[PDB]
Write a protein that binds this ligand. Sequence first.
Ligand SMILES: Nc1ncnc2c1ncn2[C@@H]1O[C@H](COP(=O)(O)OP(N)(=O)O)[C@@H](O)[C@H]1O
Ligand SMILES: Nc1cc(Br)ccn1
Ligand SMILES: [Cl-]
Ligand SMILES: [Cl-]
Ligand SMILES: [Mg+2]
Length: 386
Amino acid sequence: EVAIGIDLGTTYSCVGICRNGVVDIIANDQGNRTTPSYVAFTDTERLIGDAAKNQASRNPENTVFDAKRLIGRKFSETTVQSDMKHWPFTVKGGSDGKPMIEVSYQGEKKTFHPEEISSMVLKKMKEVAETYLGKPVKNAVITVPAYFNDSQRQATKDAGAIAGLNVLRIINEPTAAAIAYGLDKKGKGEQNILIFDLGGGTFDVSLLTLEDGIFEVKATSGDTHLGGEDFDNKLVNFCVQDFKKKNGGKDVSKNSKSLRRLRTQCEKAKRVLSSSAQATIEVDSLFDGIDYNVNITRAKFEELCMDQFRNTLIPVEKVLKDAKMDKSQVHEIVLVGGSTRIPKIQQLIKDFFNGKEPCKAINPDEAVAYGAAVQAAILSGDQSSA
Ligand SMILES: Nc1ncnc2c1ncn2[C@@H]1O[C@H](COP(=O)(O)OP(N)(=O)O)[C@@H](O)[C@H]1O
Ligand SMILES: Nc1cc(Br)ccn1
Ligand SMILES: [Cl-]
Ligand SMILES: [Cl-]
Ligand SMILES: [Mg+2]
């Protein structure tokens, strides 16, 4: 009888429940409202979520992430050949052409299909809800990007089944975000909704039309390789060069563990810069036992990411062109994804839409799970959200 909504994200996942018409986004063991889509294997245990992400730099080879980029794909796909450069873990092709992720677990070589790794993230999200509710959870709505093909959708559904979930429906992420804001329950008539989703590793822009409580995806565009991690990399490259100027040309980039440790601190400083004018990047004994410290102003961060931030408008222009409509025709701009908290990005979008305030009241990294939870309640016979 209990049904949850799950955003199975590239970098972070989120679980919600719609009860009595209101949605609760459920915090995990560490009090975090989102959980990394990470699975790690050590000599003793299988870690999922925060624990897996936290030990990633100490165990790169056995810490799996980005399974969403492999789910439902053939290993031979050019996207896999391209994306695999970004992975410290081993991925090979099986005789059936399916990707096999290879790790060492308890001193033994283990292989997993992408949907098996995703099933472990889904199982963690299911357990997060169960701990909160004090009851087992069987039903769920799981979200996928609007561009996901039948193979990718079916493999995501299979991951849910492996996790012990009865998947009521697979829905589009942009549609879930629009459902979260109740844009389907508004008596305007037709409504043109632009979903601007900038997460940890991907950027998706979707133009939806809503006539008579029914959402249609008119056009989609974006960049599968633009997200928060690329903004972290802009800070990393700057810090690497700053370390060279401070320590007689010594190159941190030669040590992959030094880069990973620096990346962790750059991401934290980036988050601080969304609410403060300055942040400190500090790594004790970064490279050759040399301590590293630097102050980054929001203006410096904006300058480093200037082109990347501005180019987020290019897929916006492309969806409007594909849908044959003017930017003035967009009724609501919904901000989704944790990177939409960056003030420069919010300002760029607002200026582009001629001063129209975007819809950002719901925590942008929770809006998709929020909508999926509303849809799961509706599919369970609960009409209280309307
Ligand atoms: N306060 C913040 N300011 C800037 N970026 C932030 C932030 N809070 C989260 N983010 C970024 O959001 C990204 C994760 O967003 P999320 O929406 O959870 O990821 P996902 N898997 O659904 O694509 C990470 O790159 C993270 O650093
Ligand atoms: N956003 C991304 C995605 C991959 Br794969 C690598 C780097 N950045
Ligand atoms: Cl329910
Ligand atoms: Cl409760
Ligand atoms: Mg999201």
